[PDB]
Design a protein around this ligand. Structure first.
Ligand SMILES: COc1ncc(C[n+]2csc(CCOP(=O)(O)OP(=O)(O)O)c2C)c(N)n1
Ligand SMILES: COc1ncc(C[n+]2csc(CCOP(=O)(O)OP(=O)(O)O)c2C)c(N)n1
Ligand SMILES: [Ca+2]
Ligand SMILES: [Ca+2]
Lengths: 667, 664
């Protein structure tokens, strides 16, 4: 078959699968099919029989609405994605969801769709390859050597996150990152010139990319040459400007917004088959076309050759090879649990009244020698977020390092880190002031959706940061994280809870962990052995009374010290009180009903929550017959100690609110 | 005094005010002082005696951590910002908060600090000026003619939002937008080359900006020539690449990250006074220096001349002048309330089962002729969000129009709209799929913090959108909006609630309103006159029983019809059931306690919330002894009907959860 005929198999499967679903996006798959045919058949290094091969090239579809493009490619090249799944595009529990999802589908590297995040993930995958190669390759033994290819469209280009990640990719000289821009002139509102007029090539050359202009994206020879030229440029990421016709093949919808995001229609599909010369019925592919598309034999040969390389590496570098395997599998060192528990126990025995940001740095320092897989960073806040430890080495200084200066790029940082976690080999941590989780908010959500391990270090968590004022002082951000499916959020009250939360985060394989950390010093609380072990249960009894309490304080973070002081005052007056420390609501909620009842007994309705954050969250635990000492407004610019007083975070106010609550219960 | 001495007054006030507060950012004020002296003394058109003058130039400090720069300028030029306020920098309830805040301080145009948002706001102010000029200017009567000047640093340049807004500013040919880049080589982590290497000038030329490279930001002559060149370019926005030394004047901390964000220290301040030749004590400014900085005389002359121009315009164009004044004041048309109520009543009397996104479009259509101040748009989703009405005119086609194709730029769109609302003259609306509020999330927060009127049209609100799947299907986004201070959030259940929510949004005077709108068709509910009037109270009794209820359903949006169906089944069994429609929790919470008790009586604890969004929000209204039929997970890619079944939004499940609750 000709290359065009082979590309037309993608066009047919895509338009037909969209038509059967009565839903989806035929335009981009049809527009990019010729580019995909060249990339996948002539360049991509992959094995359909082992999508987890450590040294495979990575492909990312940033314009993820064009999901039938990737499903067509995976099916045609021989991945475990049968035709029946393509017939079930966009149907419940299929392996072909409307936007591609990692883990749903053999060979899908990342979950994309939200525009711009795929190219960010690709930048992270390329950072991961470069860093892993620098750490592990040895003379005569280049066990890490693979490309990262991304497809992206006008939407990804317009999004700010593309500026963040492509600027940084230029700084880091990511020569194995090769992106293809689907330059088709169309977006949902119509012809893009009304709203998008950049000289995109000039923009990317400003970032330090190698840019190939004016590629005919429907001419295989032109595409091939461009890819060869990009793979030969080793010191700059490459952008291939591919002029395409959206909906290529459709006489009436090609080149129109109408092809973007709805089925073409049966009549138009018939005309499209006639224009393309594609005779096969829907979901029909002849054996000769499979024979030309299939990648099993070549992929086997390539992976077998790599396995020989790796065996030779392991003979020469046995400990390094064992580390490579461990890290690519995402496994933890066998002695990490015991060492981390020893550190936590030492902290409990050796109080220190320090900020939880500093307790976080101390945990990084303790873990760093044990976790060479860390690839950490901050969005231009290293000296404030406290993300450097003595063993940190920035990768812009030495490519075998373990630290990234992300710059002022919170969203890009977080989505890059998603790419790092998806690549394998690393455990990323990212950091900014908590407020600016709002800049990165959907990338945080994507980490949770993709079930990725990433520790998110968010410092300066409340009005306790003081004078920078309400644009910086979080109020409602923690509550937003707490209600995010599969998110873990920890607001430790002292250096011990901080170390427990760090341990929890690095050991959490199936989703991310946000640490909510103070600027100001936090008192260490006394704990028995059981209480120390109970921190990891998310909520636990810290102070108690004999018999059923008539009042339970529930507090987090910096406010535990205040709640304990109120408990002491009330206890001295004969009130039966309890304090619950709730460092993680999500972990608490995952405990069984008996444990949760033991901490928050249903008989006790006089519950007082204390937290320098939005009050409305806490109805979940205090109900309608309690009290909340929380924030209900934005903050103010002033010294923190004056803010806590003004907003009611004082022993006198907490005691008064508790006594008022009890008075109402009594009368 | 020399121009350097005049600039050094900013340096002294800034370093001394930071020192006294023991907090703040001396570096950028010291680095930018010479640029500020030229801009403010030689070019800026403003009146300290009236910071609200409609035709003033707008200045925006996007690198807002350098707040003492603006406080120094406002004090020195004669605004109502006395020295004792500068001595109270960063102190409780002062007029000099650590990042500048609109409304706190005479002459501050916007609240900045979160990096990149100031330049976005400036783009919006420049769009507003261009559009208002096109709408109102007439031959011989150019009543709108002013510049928008912005300062910005490396942080703003690195942020993605700068790409969004500066790309769009290039498309829109905003020749009166002039930005100054503080190119000082330093950020918090140190020397920026380790993480920021763009050819920024080339980048901005790629956006279609006029760029002036290599300006000596410590040389008044160089700065002045560059500003003159930029003003003379009328068909593109300009970027001035100003090479500065952060902390200029400090022997030991100039050019260092140390000068960014902490007091210099007393010894270093003394050395800085020596290096600068600045002889005056902290908070001492000699009369000569005030005389050269003061803008009161010139500013009043310029504003009076404008007033006389406006008076002549009003004689020639009386109706247009009255509209200009009304719109610049942010007032609503006197008959808007009555006309909007008439529209709402018509909808209630003429039921339609349509998506609330369509009901939103229909409200825009009804309001459009009444609200010429609308300046609306969508982030490349006009045909899906349904933001166009018959009278929409895109400003890229007709500069006197009322609609912006924002492109795929959600954060930039929202922060541009903040600039539009801050400018005066317009009522912006913005739109995207609800999920992608997360891309714009801090700009939404900033609208609320700044008490700005903006209607945020968020469609495709739940698993009801169907096959696009979990990356698109909102779950927890509404709950986050609901707990944001000063946000209003409406999730209307039908076309009538949708119109009421739109009316509420446009009538806010002091904050934004998010509309949470469905992809799919919503049945219209029947209402008495009292119920119709009570939609605007945010929560109301939609279906009731005789006597005290035994069971109360609380539902929103697309789930009201489901709650009603469960109510009908339980009512037929003989349960004393009620349905409360809760389109806006914030409007409900602001009602008097008797009204709230009439809807959600405190004695009735058997409450079942029903909403295709995160369950955890609803404990606020159901407490510990109720039930919630909500989401607890991400969505899935499938047809909407099947998803509602998969996730428990069925009559059987709602009834079962209510019966379980009643059985205790
Ligand atoms: C903020 O995140 C975000 N917002 C909106 C959408 C929906 N959407 C898909 S595509 C496109 C605009 C056009 O994107 P573009 O690649 O040019 O399209 P095609 O040419 O058809 O491939 C838009 C607007 C999305 N998926 N993610
Ligand atoms: C995402 O929003 C955001 N994130 C962080 C900060 C804190 N911060 C202020 S400045 C700067 C980096 C350097 O910003 P830059 O203008 O170069 O500084 P100077 O040269 O001292 O003026 C940083 C990192 C902020 N205000 N807003
Ligand atoms: Ca396109
Ligand atoms: Ca800087």
């Amino acid at each position: 078959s000709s290359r065009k005929e082979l590309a037309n198999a993608i066009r047919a499967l895509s338009m037909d699968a969209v038509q059967k679903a009565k839903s989806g996006h035929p335009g981009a798959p049809m527009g990019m099919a010729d580019i995909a045919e060249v990339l996948w058949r002539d360049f991509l290094k992959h094995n359909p029989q082992n999508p987890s091969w450590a040294d495979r090239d990575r492909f990312v579809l940033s314009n993820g609405h064009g999901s039938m493009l990737i499903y067509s490619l995976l099916h045609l090249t021989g991945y475990d994605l049968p035709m029946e799944e393509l017939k079930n595009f966009r149907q419940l529990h299929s392996k072909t969801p409307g936007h591609p999802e990692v883990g749903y589908t053999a060979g899908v590297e990342t979950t994309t769709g939200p525009l711009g995040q795929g190219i960010a993930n690709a930048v992270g995958m390329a950072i991961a390859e470069k860093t892993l190669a620098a750490q592990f390759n040895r003379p005569g033994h280049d066990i890490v050597d693979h490309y990262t290819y991304a497809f992206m469209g006008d939407g990804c280009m317009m999004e700010g996150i593309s500026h963040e990640v492509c600027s940084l990719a230029g700084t880091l000289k990511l020569g194995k990152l090769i992106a293809f821009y689907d330059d088709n002139g169309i977006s949902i509102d119509g012809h893009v010139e009304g709203w998008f007029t950049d000289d995109t090539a000039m923009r990317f050359e400003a970032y330090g990319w190698h840019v190939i202009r004016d590629i005919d994206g429907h001419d295989a020879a032109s595409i091939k040459r461009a890819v060869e030229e990009a793979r030969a440029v080793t010191d700059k990421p490459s952008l291939l400007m591919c002029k395409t016709i959206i909906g290529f093949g459709s006489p009436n919808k090609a080149g129109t917004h109408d092809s973007h995001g709805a089925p073409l229609g049966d009549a138009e599909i018939a005309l499209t088959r006639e224009q393309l010369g594609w005779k096969y019925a829907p979901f029909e592919i002849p054996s000769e076309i499979y024979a030309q598309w299939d990648a099993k034999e070549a992929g086997q040969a390539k992976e077998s050759a790599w396995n020989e390389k790796f065996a030779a590496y392991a003979k020469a570098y046995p400990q390094e090879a064992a580390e490579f395997t461990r890290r690519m599998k995402g496994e933890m060192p066998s002695d990490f649990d015991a060492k981390a528990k020893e550190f936590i126990a030492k902290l409990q025995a050796n109080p220190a009244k320090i900020a939880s940001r500093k307790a976080s740095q101390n945990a990084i320092e303790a873990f760093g020698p044990l976790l060479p897989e860390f690839l950490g960073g901050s969005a231009d806040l290293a000296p404030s977020n406290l993300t450097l430890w003595s063993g940190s080495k920035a990768i812009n200084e030495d490519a075998a390092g373990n630290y990234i200066h992300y710059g002022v790029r919170e969203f890009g940082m977080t989505a890059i880190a998603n790419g790092i976690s998806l690549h394998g080999g690393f455990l990323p941590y990212t950091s900014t002031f908590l407020m600016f989780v709002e800049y990165a908010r959907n990338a945080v959500r994507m980490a949770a959706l993709m079930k990725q391990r990433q520790v998110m270090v968010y410092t300066h968590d409340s009005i306790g940061l003081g004078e920078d004022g309400p644009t910086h002082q979080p109020v409602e951000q923690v509550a937003s994280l707490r209600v995010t499916p599969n998110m873990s959020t920890w607001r430790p009250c002292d250096q011990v809870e901080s170390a427990v939360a760090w341990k929890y985060g690095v050991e959490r394989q199936d989703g991310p962990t946000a640490l909510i950390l103070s600027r100001q010093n936090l008192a260490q609380q006394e704990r028995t052995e059981e209480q120390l072990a109970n921190i990891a249960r998310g909520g636990y009894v810290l102070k108690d009374c004999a018999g059923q309490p008539e009042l339970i304080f529930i507090a987090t973070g910096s406010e535990v010290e205040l709640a304990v002081a109120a408990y002491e005052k009330l206890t001295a007056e004969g009130v039966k009180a309890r304090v619950v420390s709730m460092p993680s609501t999500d972990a608490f909620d995952k405990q069984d009903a008996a444990y949760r009842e033991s901490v928050l007994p249903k008989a006790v309705t006089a519950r007082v929550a204390v937290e320098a954050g939005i009050a409305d969250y806490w109805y979940k635990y205090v109900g309608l017959n309690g009290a909340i000492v929380g924030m209900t407004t934005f903050g103010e610019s002033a010294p923190a100690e004056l803010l806590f007083e003004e907003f009611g975070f004082t022993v006198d106010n907490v005691v008064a609110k508790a006594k008022e609550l009890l008075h109402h219960h009594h009368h």
